[PDB]
DNA sequence: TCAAGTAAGCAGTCCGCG
DNA sequence: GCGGACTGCTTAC
């Protein structure tokens, strides 16, 4: 097989890398790199080397990296540019694999971990790691074997060993449900003593030792407690066994309200799932404990247990290791269905950098930029310091705040990258410049064409039409992966809508799942064969149909995120082709093509329903426009139309054959104005939205810019078996929102769109109603907390401290002197409520870490104390007022003149 | 040599206000 | 009490 690194490090003038070799063995070894940079040279010197702009340059190849990193200080002092890949490792791997890689994930040891440390004073801080670690399990993926180290003897308490038997029992029959499929995989290690567990677990880490380092909150938990405690209890050099080489570093990372203490195990790449998980899910969660997430994407249940952890050691060390075993195993199940370290994988070789370098999409591109160049032999330019200077962006039209009974929208394709490969935006492609006129006046087709000879942006910006740049070749290549794998999610969700349809008419027998390619949609045999299937068969297979749905959308998601972010880069003063003219000939050409488009459609609009002037185009967002329906249904009639499905029909045809003709015309105009390289403007119909025909359903509505919600029956092609609300920005997508309140919100909105008026009101009565009798956590609000110190004046809230600090500051005060309550961690997320006046805790509201039941010792005085009255107001009126007065209709009637007695 | 971007809405505090 | 000038948090893109 084709070999591959698994690591790679620089340690003075050595290159430490752990490989796959041809054989499929690990190996390592370290390497006295010698690298190269350049320096510009006269025209009279014959060379292979060329900067990006085709000026010759000098190699100049080192003894040492040493070497060539002094050289670079000399280079600067003098005042000449250095160039070259300045992260020598980046350059080791580009030289050692000269090859598109092609990597065996087989063969990558990825482990996964989880400590438990009883700590009877408070959260067991790593730095310290005063107290005994009485618990791991390790996941080694090549062995497929989850290793349980578990301290029966501790100053905290003596206990038996744990028993297997009782861990796969049911919890109804006293058992601890770890799942029968993994019951078979464990191996169970006690100890008596702490230092032969650590000493054991050490040896077993040499001879299985982790490439891929993953867990939850193992970069800022596990790793620097084991770390520590080991350091602590054998000396330093024992716990640098933890690195294959050796070497390791305590790193502080920094953000605007202080900085914390990681170790850097030096030959590892450490992948915190948590960090992959806020990265690459696309979510904002109200809590990051384990298990609410694995709740949230799993949906298993809470795992119980009777009193504080600090104490479940001691009173049940049964359940205690099973839920360390299980938190293990619901990382893989979470991974299992988000597929993130094989996004990770599969990104991190393309662009050949470190694993975790993955989290850096301006270290991804410089790579994958400079494995580019370096392939022809051409020389990257050296990185410069740059002022951050604001810069525009999209153009976000003002709608008209109002119900929209019919709507159709449209949307461009990867908009940015886009824009980069029509235009051709690249360092290296700047052909010069034009006199802008203002941006309406290209908008409207009135200003003179900026060139006939070159590619234009209207921020006065020209490119050579005539060659590629390394920029749009290399984000067009991510771009048609991103294509490929959302093509895929787009099968597979159609595909899971044949399968709901089938699941309102089962037809009971015993049959199995068929087995397909759920990335395809299905044929109409397989679509005969799904009619046929009992329920149990069509659940197996809408749940396998919506796994390769996530696997897709994963995989399409985060590409697009990658390439949208080679544009932002060009933003960024870090990036080493930062270039505000680049950056704002992307942003100001999206303006331009949004607004441009807007015109066309109202054009076309007006023309075909045989009008003058209506407006049609009712709202739009840096490259979307929002279509009002209502005169092209009204243009045909209801009554022309036999159902909901008739009419969706109908603007489905009417958009394919009609509008998007009209739109590709006219953006063919707009490239031709421009005088671009390529047309690469495709603007797909979104959504189809509407109230089921005969319904007073609104059908959808905007309370402003970045506000709406839409009843839509299609989506992108996907013909949904249930109409699907699409809210856009109201409180119902916000993580502060409480949960209940979500839930409430949602439903007003559905009654309002789909049912009309007098079903909102019903729902609000009913609610306002019951609103009282909801669990605490599911009306609490929820904030992030930062800069707590910065407030706290004496345990008490300073000047223009924020709602939610306040909160934690009564916490504080009513938690003082018990060092079993936990903590609020700076920068973590909390619940907030609300408090009457005249409550013992002697401030308007409370705050505790979110995810948790508030500790026991407060818990009855909050609830008891809770302002249900504020609660409402503020997070359910407040929101349901904007939403009904912009759809002009009431959640409550509504004096009139009609009193008299209607019964 | 660590290090995607801008636009924009709502909720809170402070403070003015015979 | 409201509305305006800020901060803080958060989402749409
Ligand atoms: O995280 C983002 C999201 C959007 N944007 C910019 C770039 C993107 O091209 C543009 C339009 O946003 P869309 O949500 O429409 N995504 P895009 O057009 O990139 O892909 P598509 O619409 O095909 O999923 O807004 C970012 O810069 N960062
Ligand atoms: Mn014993
Ligand atoms: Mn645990
Ligand atoms: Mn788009
Ligand atoms: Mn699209
Ligand atoms: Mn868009």
């Not at 003596?158 to 191996?187: F, H, M, R, T, Y």
């Not at 609104?698 to 839509?712: E, S």
């Amino acid at each position: 097989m084709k070999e591959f690194y698994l690591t790679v490090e620089q340690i003075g003038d050595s290159i430490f890398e752990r490989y796959i070799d041809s054989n499929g063995r690990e190996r390592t070894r370290e390497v006295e790199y010698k690298p190269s940079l350049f320096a510009h040279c006269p025209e009279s010197q014959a060379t292979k080397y060329f900067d990006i702009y085709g000026k010759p340059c000098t190699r100049k190849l080192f003894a040492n990296m040493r070497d060539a990193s002094q050289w670079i200080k000399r280079m600067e002092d003098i005042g000449l540019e250095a160039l070259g890949m300045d992260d020598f490792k980046l350059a080791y791997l580009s030289d050692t694999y000269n090859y598109e890689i092609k990597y065996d994930h087989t063969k990558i040891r990825v482990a996964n971990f989880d400590i438990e440390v009883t700590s009877p004073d408070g959260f067991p801080e790593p730095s310290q790691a005063k107290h005994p670690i009485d618990a791991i399990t390790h996941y080694d993926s090549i062995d497929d074997r989850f290793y349980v180290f578990d301290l029966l003897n501790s100053p905290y308490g003596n206990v038996e060993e744990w028993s297997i038997e009782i861990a796969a029992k049911l919890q109804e029959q006293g058992g601890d449900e770890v799942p029968s499929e993994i019951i078979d995989k464990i191996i169970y290690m006690p100890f008596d003593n702490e230092k032969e567990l650590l000493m054991e677990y050490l040896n077993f880490w040499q001879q299985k030792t982790p490439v891929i380092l993953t867990g939850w909150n193992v970069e800022s938990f596990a790793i620097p407690y084991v770390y520590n405690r080991i350091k602590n209890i054998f000396g330093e050099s024992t716990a640098k066994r933890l690195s294959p080489h050796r070497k390791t570093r305590v790193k502080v990372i920094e953000n605007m309200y202080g900085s914390r203490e990681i170790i850097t195990l030096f030959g590892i790449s450490v992948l915190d799932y948590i960090d992959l998980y806020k990265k690459f899910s696309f979510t904002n969660q109200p809590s990051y404990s384990l298990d609410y997430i694995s709740e949230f994407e799993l949906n298993v249940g809470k795992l119980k247990y009777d009193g504080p952890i600090s104490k479940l050691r001691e009173s049940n060390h049964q359940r205690y290791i099973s839920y360390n075993i299980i938190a293990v195993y619901r990382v893989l199940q979470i991974d299992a269905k988000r597929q993130f370290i094989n996004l990770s994988l599969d990104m991190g070789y393309y662009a050949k950098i470190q694993i975790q370098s993955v989290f850096s999409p301006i270290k991804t591109w410089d790579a994958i930029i400079f494995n580019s160049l370096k392939e022809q032999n051409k020389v990257i330019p050296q990185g410069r310091s740059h002022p951050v200077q604001p810069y525009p962006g999209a153009f976000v039209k003002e709608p008209i705040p109002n119900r929209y009974k019919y709507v159709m929208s449209f949307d461009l394709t990867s908009l940015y990258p886009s824009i980069i490969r029509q235009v051709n935006i690249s360092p290296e492609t700047i052909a010069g410049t034009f006199k802008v006129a203002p941006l309406h006046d290209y908008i409207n087709a009135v200003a003179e064409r900026p060139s006939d000879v070159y590619s234009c942006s209207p921020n006065g910006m020209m490119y050579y039409k005539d060659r590629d740049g390394v920029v749009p070749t290399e984000i067009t290549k991510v771009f048609n992966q991103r294509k490929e794998h959302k093509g895929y999610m787009l099968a597979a969700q159609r595909n899971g809508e044949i399968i709901k349809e089938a699941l309102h008419n089962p037809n009971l027998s015993v049959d199995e799942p068929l087995d397909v390619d759920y990335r395809f949609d299905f044929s109409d045999e397989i679509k005969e064969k799904i009619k046929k299937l009992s329920a149990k068969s069509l659940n197996e297979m809408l749940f396998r149909a919506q796994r390769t749905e996530v696997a897709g959308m994963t995989a399409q998601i985060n590409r697009k995120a990658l390439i949208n972010g080679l544009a932002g880069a060009l933003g960024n003063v870090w990036f080493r082709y930062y270039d505000l003219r680049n950056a704002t000939a992307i942003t100001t050409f999206g303006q331009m093509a949004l607004q441009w488009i807007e015109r066309k459609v109202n054009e076309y609009l007006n023309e075909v329903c045989g009008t003058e002037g209506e407006a049609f185009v009712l709202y739009g967002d840096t490259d979307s426009i929002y279509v009002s329906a209502d005169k092209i249904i009204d243009k045909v009639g209801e009554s022309k139309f036999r159902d909901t499905n008739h009419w969706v029909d109908f603007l489905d045809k009417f958009a394919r054959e009609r509008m998007e003709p009209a739109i590709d015309r006219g953006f063919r105009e707009m490239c031709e104005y421009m005088n671009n390289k390529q047309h690469l403007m495709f603007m797909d119909r979104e959504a189809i939205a509407g109230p089921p025909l005969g319904s007073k359903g609104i059908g959808g509505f905007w309370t402003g810019k970045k506000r709406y919600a839409l009843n839509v029956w299609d989506m992108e092609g996907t013909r949904y078996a249930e109409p699907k609300l699409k809210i856009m920005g109201l409180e119902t997508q916000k993580s502060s929102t409480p949960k209940a309140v979500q839930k409430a919100l949602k439903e007003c909105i559905r009654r309002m769109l789909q049912e009309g008026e007098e079903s909102l009101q019903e729902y609000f009565k009913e609610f306002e109603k019951e609103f009282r009798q909801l669990n605490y956590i599911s009306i609490a609000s929820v904030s992030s907390a930062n800069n707590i110190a910065k407030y706290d004046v004496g345990g008490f809230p300073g000047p223009k401290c924020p709602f939610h600090i306040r909160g934690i500051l009564t916490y504080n005060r009513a938690i003082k002197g018990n060092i079993d309550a936990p903590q609020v961690v700076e920068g973590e997320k909390v619940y907030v409520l609300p408090l009457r006046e005249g409550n013992p805790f002697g401030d308007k509201c409370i705050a505790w870490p979110s995810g948790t039941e508030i500790t026991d010792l407060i818990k009855d005085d909050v609830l008891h104390w809770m302002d249900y009255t504020v609660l409402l107001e503020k997070t359910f009126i407040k929101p349901l007022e904007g939403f009904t007065s912009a759809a002009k209709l009431d959640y409550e009637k509504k004096a009139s003149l009609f009193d008299m007695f209607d019964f």
